[PDB]
Amino acid sequence: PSQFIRRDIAQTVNGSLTLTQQTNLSAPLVSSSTGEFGGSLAANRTFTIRNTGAPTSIVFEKGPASGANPAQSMSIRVWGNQFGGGSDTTRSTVFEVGDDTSHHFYSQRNKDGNIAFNINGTVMPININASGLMNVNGTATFGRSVTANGEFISKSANAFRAINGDYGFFIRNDASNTYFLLTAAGDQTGGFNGLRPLLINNQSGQITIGEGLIIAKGVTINSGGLTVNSRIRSQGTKTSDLYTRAPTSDTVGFWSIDINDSATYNQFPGYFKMVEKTNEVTGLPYLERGEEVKSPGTLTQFGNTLDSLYQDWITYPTTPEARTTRWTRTWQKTKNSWSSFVQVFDGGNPPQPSDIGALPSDNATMGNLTIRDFLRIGNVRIVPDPVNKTVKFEWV
Amino acid sequence: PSQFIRRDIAQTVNGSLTLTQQTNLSAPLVSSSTGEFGGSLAANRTFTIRNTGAPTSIVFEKGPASGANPAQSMSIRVWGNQFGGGSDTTRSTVFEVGDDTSHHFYSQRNKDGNIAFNINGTVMPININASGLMNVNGTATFGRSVTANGEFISKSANAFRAINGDYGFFIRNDASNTYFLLTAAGDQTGGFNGLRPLLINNQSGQITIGEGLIIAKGVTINSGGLTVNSRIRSQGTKTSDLYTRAPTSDTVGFWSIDINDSATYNQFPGYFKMVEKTNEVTGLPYLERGEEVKSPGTLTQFGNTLDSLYQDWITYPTTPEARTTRWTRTWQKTKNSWSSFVQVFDGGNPPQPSDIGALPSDNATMGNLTIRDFLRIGNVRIVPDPVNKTVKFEWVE
Amino acid sequence: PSQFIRRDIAQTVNGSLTLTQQTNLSAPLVSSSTGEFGGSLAANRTFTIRNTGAPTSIVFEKGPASGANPAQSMSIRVWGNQFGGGSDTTRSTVFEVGDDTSHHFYSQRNKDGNIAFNINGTVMPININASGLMNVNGTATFGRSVTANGEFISKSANAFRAINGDYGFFIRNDASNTYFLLTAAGDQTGGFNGLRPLLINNQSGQITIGEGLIIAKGVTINSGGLTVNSRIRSQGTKTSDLYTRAPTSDTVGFWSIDINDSATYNQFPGYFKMVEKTNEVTGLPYLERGEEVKSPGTLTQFGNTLDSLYQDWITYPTTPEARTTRWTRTWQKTKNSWSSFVQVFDGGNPPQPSDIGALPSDNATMGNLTIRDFLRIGNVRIVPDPVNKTVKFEWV
């Protein structure tokens, strides 16, 4: 009969055809069913995966465990949960790539319209150039410099640390004081040792330096004064010409100098070897100056200006008979000279009668004396006898 | 006749075939036209999308708005603009993935040969490990420590800030000076308050400390001296043995000590009671030294070396009739002793005639006296009379 | 016999069919060979690339070099090296996207089960939000602030640098000392100049300030004392009432003041004019006190407390014949007053006979005198004579 396929009219074929030679088409192939090719496949321009109610995907099979094959199969799936009526409906459009175990990564647009690219592990780029914000929850390490156009802010008590060689140096704000601190040697990332180089009180701003301070090029305290425990060495500049040296703006002020070299101290006043004499009548001793002897001593200056300046010279003894004598002088700005050193009068260096214009108590000579009431010589009193217009004698 | 398909030779079919049963092929299928499968599709090893003049793509349809379907369709497109003759021809090879609204991401090889991976939103990895450079234009926040092998550099005036509790501490380089500054309490991320703990002049390096300074373990000024407004309390170390204590390298220098305890000051010189006498002839007063009375006082030392050192002792009055007296001594290194304190002579503590070997102004006694010109007793003048080897007595009215 | 195809029975076609009209299928198409479509292709729900020994891939052809075509073809390949491929066996499953030259990016799960997403160039997101760690090997730049909840640590000698205007300020830990340093003007990223504002010794914590120090609001040295090279100007607060001013807790201590204005110095003691006289008998000179002359001077105070406090007043000459005199007084807390200034006795300002109750050396008057041994008038000794109960004269 005509149970054969017509070659020129539209035919429905109810046999299962097996084409053993190349099949050539020049018109659309339209199937309601599946396709399977045991060889490779190619199409022009576009491949569309149609969706009739279940999300579309591509599957990349792992194949046998040999050659260049993967350990697991992979897929690309385009899906969402906006329409699923679940507890999460915010994953509107998701492009997900992953294997049998879990996703590797996905991009998604959420219901709010914003895009996220999630990586289920470590992102390893060469460079990073982000136009927006960065947040990193874990520890960060940088191999070179880090430059910000803004401020670096730490919320950690130990905030900024510089490590080099054996030591970490760090700034610590402990909420009460901010400290500059140091580690033990070889403990560069660890805690502070016992040193307290510098701290600032967070409330008052007062600074404490705890391990000593050296300053070069001068100090000025503008206000509030100075308290020192427990000595001050103000060390004057010792020059060969101290005896005659005019003060300058650099050398005014308080200082002391140990003048211990004879080339200098021979120019200054000496001490006097003292000679003890004894009053013939009372037996009380008194001192008189013997020879002047040059001596080392301390030169101390006081006063703050080229007008207001004076010095003290205190000899110090370096031999058994040596004694200390003090001398003073004043800078005379208008005369452009030091006053001459004058000796301080003290119990070790008293003034003599001849220094003051007083009669010696012993062996004295004078031009004239007037006695009002009586002169006694040994046991005779000589008194005025105005009646006989003379003097009366009077044994006692 | 030949309006039927042959099973044995090549055959052109000119009617539309509908195959209702499975079709098997064992040789290539070559179409110059489209393919449409209402079911799923599979191929072996490689799928190739061919390009005859327009970029190639895969389209993932969104389907009905139900189940696990996406809200928008997506595509993968491979394209470029190197050959399009536009103002931009630098996007040489682009792999772009996105939806109906915009791309989600793309990778691109630029015309310069370098690769970029652009993400149109937020990237959310677990770890990051970059072998090259990082740039971030916006604010950065880190949850733990940040370690660099290089330098941290800020171009912001407020450059480095440590926040803890109520306060921010920060370093500010304002182009003229660099300051160490503090915020008001509870204003930790804000501006500086009025405090000026420390600043450094950027030109000279000179430091100003603005809120006071405490120092432990010594200060040395190497050069330039010291100016102080407006007093210096150099507080010496007070010990029970100050009267006899040899100086040490630690105690040389200038200081003062208030010796206010009698166990110590009773070892030191006292002040002297003074009696005011009157010269009978002239009526002018003079002070006669009385009893020494022990007293608290100030001990002040000067000198900087174990050779060059001396002290002043200035008593101060604590009772209604007490006076003040000053005393001095000097350290004697070669004797290993202080000289004995000696009294300073001054208008309140004058030298006494017996101290100096001067005759008292009245009621006096002496061994002998020589008069050259005259001695007068009452109205009698006694004068030399050498021609008679005697003296004359002249009443002189 | 029947070299024609049955339209209702399973057939094996052995010549090449060329179909010129639309082919419809309603059952599976199953091929052991390849497919090639010159138009677009579509399938429902899933596309699977089967793997029978070689890794699966999709190839996107580059086409002619015109329009919107890419310069190179691209592929997505899913492969691994766990089962072959040289010396590395750790790349278990790799999803690789790239062109003819190299990969652009890949995701992979390694043998240990961990996922990496590798980008062969620059990643350019808007925001970054990493839940784990960050490492960046190259230089890093931030456009705004950088906040860390932890510590910032630098291993670079030059550790923290703040740049503004012409200068960089930086903290440098050089292993031995930590320095606060400054650049030359206009060399903001460069080395330190010669300035040494501040350094901390890493071992002792001792601080050195190298370019001068100003302090406001007071200084206290708690221990260790003070050494100064080479002067100290302790400048007291000059007020109009210095003569009578009671000390306060703020004004106790050591200082000097130049009292240069007569309104104030006229209240203080002057110097005394002196005339040099000569003792006629001995030829020895002595200074005789004359008028007080008001003078500017230096007031210096010593002592640290409201009990322990005293002052020196040292006049200085401002006219050609002016002398210098020193005066002293002590603060008397219990009397709430300064003692009266008293004159210092020195070689330029000796005591006078009237100060001490001594007889002047000549031209003198007194009430009475007792002579134990002899009175000599001219060359006659007047001595006591017991035998007549008067005096005898003896020529010498």
Author numbering:
A (entry chain A), C (entry chain C): 893 to 1288
B (entry chain B): 893 to 1289
Paper passage:
The proximal half-fiber is formed by a parallel homo-trimer of gp34. The protein is a highly intertwined trimer containing a 2 nm-wide triple β-helix domain interspersed with three wider domains in which each of the monomers forms an anti-parallel β-sheet. The long tail fibers recognize the outer membrane protein C (OmpC) or the lipopolysaccharide (LPS) of E. coli and are responsible for the initial and reversible attachment of the virion. The carboxy-terminal parts of gp34 that we crystallized occupy the part of the proximal tail fiber closest to gp35 (the “knee”).
